[PDB]
Amino acid sequence: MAAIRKKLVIVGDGACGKTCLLIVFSKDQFPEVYVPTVFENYVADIEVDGKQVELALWDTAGQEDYDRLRPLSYPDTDVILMCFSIDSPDSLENIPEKWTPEVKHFCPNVPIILVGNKKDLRNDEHTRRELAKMKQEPVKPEEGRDMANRIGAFGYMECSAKTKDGVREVFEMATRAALQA
Amino acid sequence: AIHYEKDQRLKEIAAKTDQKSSGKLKNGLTFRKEDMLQQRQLHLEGALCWKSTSGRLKDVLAVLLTDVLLLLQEKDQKYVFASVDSKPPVISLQKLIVREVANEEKAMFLISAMQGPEMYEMYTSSKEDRNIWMAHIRRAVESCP
Ligand SMILES: Nc1nc2c(ncn2[C@@H]2O[C@H](COP(=O)(O)OP(=O)(O)OP(O)(O)=S)[C@@H](O)[C@H]2O)c(=O)[nH]1
Ligand SMILES: [Mg+2]
C-alpha cells in the first residue's frame, strides 16, 4: 500500500554482506546459508519521517566474473548502497578502485550510500587476532568516513545484518537519498 | 476437434509465420520460419506481454522450443518476430536464468548470458501462470543441447 516506489541497487565485493543486509531488511531474518549471488530482486517497505515508501531491492554479484551482468541492474536506479566489510580492508580498497568508477559510469547522478557491513566483527577478539597475523586490522569509522568523502558519497553508515545494529538506519538514509530529485 | 498436440501446434505456428520475417539472436545469427521446423520440439507456447522500456505492455506469442525461446507479434494475420526495444526476440536457452519480479507476482525476468547479456521482463496472466512458465523454461534450459 505504499504510494511511493523507489529502486535501490546494492554493489560491493563478493562476500561483503550485501544479500544478508537486503534479506534482514526485507524479511527480518538473517539467511544462514551463503549462496553467491548472480541476480536477485526483493521488495521491502519502510516508514521514514512519516513517509511510507516501497523499495525494490536489486541484488547483484560481487564477483568480477559477473561484471557484464551487473549493468542489467543499474537502469533507473534511485539510490545505490555501495558496500564493503569492516573485517576486510581489501574490500574498502576496492571501493575507489572498482565500485566507484563503475557506478559513476552507469549511474552518474545517482546518490551513493557508502556502507560498512559486518560491524559486529570490529570488536570481535578472534577476528582482530586473525587479522593481526596478516598485519591487518578492522576498518575504522574514520577510514570509512574518509572514503565516503573521497568518492562523493551522499552518506556513510555502518551496520551488522547479523545483529541488526544499524540496518534500519542504512535504509532510512537510503530512502531519504532515493526521494531527492 | 483433433486434440492439441505440441508438434502439430509448432507446424501451425510456422505456417502462420511471415516468410519474410526474421528474428535476431544475441550472437548476431537470425532465426526464420524454416528454423522452427528443423529438428525442434515445442515445450510450451502461449500469450505473454513483453514490458518495454517505455513501460508499454506489448502482446506477444511466446514459443519455447528445444534450444530457443521465440517472441512473436501479429501483423496482417501472420506472425512476425517481435520488435521491442531493439532487443533480440530469439533467446538462446543456454545460460538463461529466470527470476520472479518481487513486486509483481504475474511477471518474470528472463536473463540471458558471449556477446553479452540481455534482460526481458515478461508478464503472464497470473501468479499460477508465472510459475508454469518459469518451470517450463527452467526444464527446457536443463535439457537444452
Ligand atoms: N559476522 C557477520 N557475517 C555476516 C554478516 N552479513 C553477512 N555475513 C556473512 O558473510 C557471508 C557472505 O554474506 P552475503 O550477504 O551472502 O555476501 P554477498 O555480499 O551477498 O556476496 P556475493 O553474493 O556478492 S558472492 C556469509 O557467510 C554471511 O553469513 C554480518 O553482519 N556479520
Ligand atoms: Mg549476495
Side-chain angles (χ1 to χ4, degrees), chain A, chain B residues 1-113 115-145:
Chain A
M1 194 166 59
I4 305 292
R5 285 179 302 290
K6 299 289 166 182
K7 171 171 174 172
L8 179 154
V9 174
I10 194 163
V11 305
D13 279 1
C16 77
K18 299 181 299 296
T19 299
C20 288
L21 179 58
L22 297 186
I23 298 297
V24 167
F25 179 64
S26 62
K27 294 292 183 181
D28 201 20
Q29 193 62 228
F30 187 93
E32 291 287 351
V33 180
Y34 176 19
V35 180
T37 304
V38 176
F39 175 105
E40 307 286 345
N41 73 113
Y42 320 114
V43 63
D45 295 358
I46 191 176
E47 192 180 352
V48 58
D49 304 341
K51 297 163 194 182
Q52 298 189 328
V53 182
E54 179 175 320
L55 298 174
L57 308 174
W58 290 61
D59 201 357
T60 70
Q63 294 170 258
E64 61 172 11
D65 276 2
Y66 291 104
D67 279 349
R68 286 132 171 267
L69 207 68
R70 210 167 303 101
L72 300 179
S73 294
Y74 289 140
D76 303 302
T77 298
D78 299 299
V79 62
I80 290 275
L81 295 188
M82 187 186 289
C83 299
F84 63 95
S85 174
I86 285 164
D87 75 324
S88 173
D90 182 69
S91 70
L92 178 64
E93 187 75 350
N94 282 328
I95 289 292
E97 283 318 294
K98 182 181 183 166
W99 299 110
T100 296
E102 177 169 304
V103 166
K104 297 314 299 181
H105 180 254
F106 291 104
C107 304
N109 289 305
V110 178
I112 297 161
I113 313 303
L114 181 63
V115 181
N117 284 335
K118 318 196 186 177
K119 188 185 185 186
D120 58 288
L121 296 180
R122 176 174 282 140
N123 303 126
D124 181 72
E125 294 172 348
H126 178 81
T127 297
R128 295 188 69 87
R129 184 170 77 243
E130 297 284 352
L131 290 172
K133 289 177 188 178
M134 306 185 294
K135 307 181 196 169
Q136 291 180 37
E137 56 189 8
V139 176
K140 306 175 192 297
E142 181 180 12
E143 291 167 338
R145 293 189 297 261
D146 188 57
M147 191 65 77
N149 282 276
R150 285 179 58 193
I151 70 167
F154 176 100
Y156 180 68
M157 289 297 329
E158 299 182 339
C159 67
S160 170
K162 186 166 281 275
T163 68
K164 308 191 181 179
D165 183 42
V167 171
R168 184 185 28 93
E169 291 76 21
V170 165
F171 289 92
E172 286 174 348
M173 187 183 282
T175 299
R176 294 176 175 124
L179 286 166
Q180 301 319 298
Chain B
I2 291 164
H3 172 61
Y4 182 100
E5 305 284 1
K6 287 175 179 178
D7 67 338
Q8 177 61 31
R9 177 63 172 142
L10 179 54
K11 292 183 193 180
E12 288 166 9
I13 290 164
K16 184 176 179 63
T17 297
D18 185 351
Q19 171 68 222
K20 316 190 186 191
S21 189
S22 66
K24 282 172 176 170
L25 284 74
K26 187 63 174 174
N27 70 356
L29 268 57
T30 67
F31 200 93
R32 53 196 202 147
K33 166 181 192 152
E34 289 85 349
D35 297 309
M36 293 176 179
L37 301 173
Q38 181 200 16
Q39 311 180 339
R40 285 176 171 93
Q41 284 184 329
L42 184 150
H43 294 305
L44 188 65
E45 54 87 21
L48 294 181
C49 287
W50 184 355
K51 184 177 178 182
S52 74
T53 55
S54 61
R56 285 184 219 98
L57 295 175
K58 300 233 184 182
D59 295 325
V60 296
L61 179 69
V63 187
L64 179 65
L65 307 180
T66 297
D67 59 338
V68 292
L69 174 65
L70 312 183
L71 303 177
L72 306 177
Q73 285 174 298
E74 288 189 0
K75 198 179 104 140
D76 301 338
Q77 289 303 95
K78 308 191 188 179
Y79 294 121
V80 296
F81 292 87
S83 176
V84 176
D85 301 330
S86 300
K87 294 180 154 151
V90 184
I91 303 168
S92 176
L93 297 185
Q94 285 183 206
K95 295 175 174 140
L96 181 69
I97 60 170
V98 308
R99 297 287 185 268
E100 294 179 351
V101 180
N103 64 11
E104 177 53 72
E105 66 177 11
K106 296 181 177 175
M108 61 192 171
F109 290 128
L110 309 180
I111 299 166
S112 55
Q115 298 75 19
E118 204 73 49
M119 187 167 83
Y120 303 77
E121 181 177 15
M122 311 300 301
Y123 277 60
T124 78
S125 57
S126 72
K127 182 180 77 154
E128 306 100 89
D129 277 5
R130 178 206 65 185
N131 292 339
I132 293 166
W133 269 103
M134 291 184 64
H136 276 80
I137 292 168
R138 284 173 172 154
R139 275 188 294 269
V141 169
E142 287 157 15
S143 55
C144 168

